Scaffold this active site. Sequence first.
Site, PDB file in Angstrom:
ATOM      1  N   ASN A  19       0.559  -1.293   0.029  1.00 35.28           N
ATOM      2  CA  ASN A  19       0.115  -0.106   0.021  1.00 35.28           C
ATOM      3  C   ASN A  19       0.786   1.203   0.037  1.00 35.28           C
ATOM      4  O   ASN A  19       2.048   1.188  -0.106  1.00 35.28           O
ATOM      5  CB  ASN A  19      -1.047   0.114   1.327  1.00 35.28           C
ATOM      6  CG  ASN A  19      -2.067  -1.017   1.103  1.00 35.28           C
ATOM      7  OD1 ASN A  19      -2.929  -1.026   0.218  1.00 35.28           O
ATOM      8  ND2 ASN A  19      -1.876  -2.150   1.927  1.00 35.28           N
ATOM      9  N   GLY A  20       0.029   2.442  -0.036  1.00 30.40           N
ATOM     10  CA  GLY A  20       0.805   3.591  -0.213  1.00 30.40           C
ATOM     11  C   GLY A  20      -0.173   4.711   0.039  1.00 30.40           C
ATOM     12  O   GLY A  20      -1.362   4.519   0.122  1.00 30.40           O
ATOM     13  N   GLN A  21       0.378   5.841   0.881  1.00 33.11           N
ATOM     14  CA  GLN A  21      -0.697   7.122   0.916  1.00 33.11           C
ATOM     15  C   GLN A  21      -1.422   7.662  -0.334  1.00 33.11           C
ATOM     16  O   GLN A  21      -2.419   8.269  -0.102  1.00 33.11           O
ATOM     17  CB  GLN A  21       0.212   8.258   1.605  1.00 33.11           C
ATOM     18  CG  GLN A  21      -0.562   9.500   1.866  1.00 33.11           C
ATOM     19  CD  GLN A  21      -1.772   9.523   2.490  1.00 33.11           C
ATOM     20  OE1 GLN A  21      -1.929   9.364   3.693  1.00 33.11           O
ATOM     21  NE2 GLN A  21      -2.599   9.611   1.744  1.00 33.11           N
ATOM     22  N   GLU A  24      -1.678   2.141  -4.238  1.00 31.94           N
ATOM     23  CA  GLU A  24      -1.339   0.509  -3.893  1.00 31.94           C
ATOM     24  C   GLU A  24      -0.633  -0.046  -4.942  1.00 31.94           C
ATOM     25  O   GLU A  24      -0.751   0.206  -6.164  1.00 31.94           O
ATOM     26  CB  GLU A  24      -2.988  -0.086  -3.929  1.00 31.94           C
ATOM     27  CG  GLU A  24      -3.120  -1.361  -3.513  1.00 31.94           C
ATOM     28  CD  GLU A  24      -4.345  -1.583  -2.865  1.00 31.94           C
ATOM     29  OE1 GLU A  24      -4.669  -1.324  -1.822  1.00 31.94           O
ATOM     30  OE2 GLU A  24      -5.254  -2.431  -3.570  1.00 31.94           O
ATOM     31  N   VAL A  25       0.342  -0.735  -4.461  1.00 30.88           N
ATOM     32  CA  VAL A  25       1.360  -1.468  -5.614  1.00 30.88           C
ATOM     33  C   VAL A  25       0.805  -2.847  -5.848  1.00 30.88           C
ATOM     34  O   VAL A  25       0.725  -3.800  -4.718  1.00 30.88           O
ATOM     35  CB  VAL A  25       2.687  -1.436  -5.029  1.00 30.88           C
ATOM     36  CG1 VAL A  25       3.607  -2.132  -5.987  1.00 30.88           C
ATOM     37  CG2 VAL A  25       3.302   0.039  -4.860  1.00 30.88           C
ATOM     38  N   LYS A  39       3.001   0.496  -9.700  1.00 25.57           N
ATOM     39  CA  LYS A  39       2.781   1.476  -8.419  1.00 25.57           C
ATOM     40  C   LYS A  39       1.663   2.280  -8.783  1.00 25.57           C
ATOM     41  O   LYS A  39       2.001   3.540  -9.401  1.00 25.57           O
ATOM     42  CB  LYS A  39       4.032   2.190  -8.220  1.00 25.57           C
ATOM     43  CG  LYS A  39       3.831   3.339  -7.073  1.00 25.57           C
ATOM     44  CD  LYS A  39       5.084   4.139  -6.721  1.00 25.57           C
ATOM     45  CE  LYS A  39       4.851   5.144  -5.891  1.00 25.57           C
ATOM     46  NZ  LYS A  39       5.988   5.421  -4.982  1.00 25.57           N
ATOM     47  N   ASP A 130      14.339   8.305   2.616  1.00 29.87           N
ATOM     48  CA  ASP A 130      13.414   7.267   3.233  1.00 29.87           C
ATOM     49  C   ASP A 130      14.337   5.788   3.010  1.00 29.87           C
ATOM     50  O   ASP A 130      13.455   4.655   2.559  1.00 29.87           O
ATOM     51  CB  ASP A 130      12.200   7.115   2.297  1.00 29.87           C
ATOM     52  CG  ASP A 130      11.074   6.490   3.472  1.00 29.87           C
ATOM     53  OD1 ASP A 130      11.057   6.907   4.703  1.00 29.87           O
ATOM     54  OD2 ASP A 130      10.178   5.659   2.752  1.00 29.87           O
TER      55      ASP A 130
END
Length: 263
Positions: A19-21, A24-25, A39, A130
């Site tokens: 997932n991601g902010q 979703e991958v 992605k 990151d």
Amino acid sequence: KDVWEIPRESLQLIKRLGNGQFGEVWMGTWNGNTKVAIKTLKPGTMSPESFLEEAQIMKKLKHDKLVQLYAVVSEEPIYIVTEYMNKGSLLDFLKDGEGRALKLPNLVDMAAQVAAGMAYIERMNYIHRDLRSANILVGNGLICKIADFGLARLIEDNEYTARQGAKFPIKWTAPEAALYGRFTIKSDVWSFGILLTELVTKGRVPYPGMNNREVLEQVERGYRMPCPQDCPISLHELMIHCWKKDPEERPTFEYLQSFLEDY
């Protein structure tokens, strides 16, 4: 027409990978014969222009220890098609028995790989911002690659002063970056230092018994983490090297890459 552009028809999503902010991958195939990772960007989330800033950087960075960009589907919903890594996250690869059974000399190897990739970004005048176990993907044959360039930036004069708002992983983020928003390649070095910690303790969470609030004060006052178990003092000295207060005093990934490459 765009060389990286591709028809969403040739992509066949088959499984959610993460997932991601902003999206979703997924795992899926391209033109029915090549495993890829997609992605995606959630529509009402971020600007198509922004999401794409990651793809723009990706088309400029090409290294073997860096997840490669395959294509992009520029129409909403946006798509960033890239190389697929079998083993998945380095973090979760360590949290089991496959990569968990892994002995030092092997772990040190993967570390050297991440330094090589970083060294490249270094020369390219880029910053990841990151760096950490979870963002390191593992492929076949213990291959490790840096992924997720969502916060990567081309270094201007030498640093990047964020909107002073964005919140970063307090435990992996260097003090001068999270207190002044002064990010540099040296900031990733600090993060590399904390990654060693992970890669050495089976993906344990840095600074065990403390919290982002606490961890903020100890580190500040000058307190770092102690040599993890069954962990040579040799490379813990490498870690304290990566955690120096003055960033100029912290090593370069070039150095780091060779250091881990020799044992």
